[PDB]
């Protein structure tokens, strides 16, 4: 069955709440597994302590940066980057979980959660999950964003793991 992961989100360290995600391992196993393992930290690096550094109201919340030797921008569990697995799933509405990238076949650790349908990203970003619980928390996060994405307070992943 598809795995579920959670983030406990904080705002300048003050707990906001939990967002849980279903990861579509049945459709994008490699991409789901990357996010899953980064969420548990089992490879020795991952999302715990990272921030949502780009939050654009009415669009998406992006995070997944963390420090490693050749960068501060995060990396996958397969070495630095990996290929776009497939584009089966679309950015159909709020709660979609999808990979950030720097063009084709540049998936690392960065991801975003859509707060709206973003169909212009279909075929450009690999959708691999969706918000299960805590969409209210994502909406709360969104209110700390801005039009250029800069956040007005530090939105962090205080804890994360697998449910």
């Amino acid at each position: 069955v598809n795995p579920t992961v959670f983030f406990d989100i904080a705002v300048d360290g003050e707990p906001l709440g939990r967002v849980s995600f279903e990861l579509f391992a049945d459709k994008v196993p490699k991409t789901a597994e990357n996010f899953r393992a980064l969420s548990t930290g089992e490879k020795g690096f991952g999302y715990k302590g990272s921030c949502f550094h780009r939050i654009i109201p009415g669009f998406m919340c992006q995070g997944g940066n963390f420090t490693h030797h050749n960068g501060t921008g995060g990396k996958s569990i397969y070495g630095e980057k990996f290929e776009d697995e497939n584009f089966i799933l679309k950015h159909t509405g709020p709660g979609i979980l999808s990979m950030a990238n720097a063009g084709p076949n540049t998936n690392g650790s960065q991801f975003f959660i859509c707060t709206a349908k973003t169909e212009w990203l279909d075929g450009k970003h690999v959708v691999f999950g969706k918000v299960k619980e805590g969409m209210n928390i994502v909406e709360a996060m969104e209110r700390f964003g801005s039009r250029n994405g800069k956040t007005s307070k530090k939105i962090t992943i205080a804890d994360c793991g697998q449910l």
Binding site: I56, F59, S98, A100, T118, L121, K124
Partner: peptide
Amino acid sequence: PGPLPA
């Protein structure tokens, strides 16, 4: 830059 807004 992050996913494009359009």
